[PDB]
């Protein structure tokens, strides 16, 4: 796989880091 067993999780972390550093932090 190209892909570690992390992925959706780690993508979803990204998305939730990304929304809170566009939103501010609440």
């Not at 992390?6 to 972390?13: A, C, H, Q, S, T």
């Amino acid at each position: 796989s190209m892909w570690s067993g992390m992925w959706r999780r780690k993508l979803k972390k990204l998305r939730n880091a990304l929304k809170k550093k566009l939103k501010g932090e609440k």
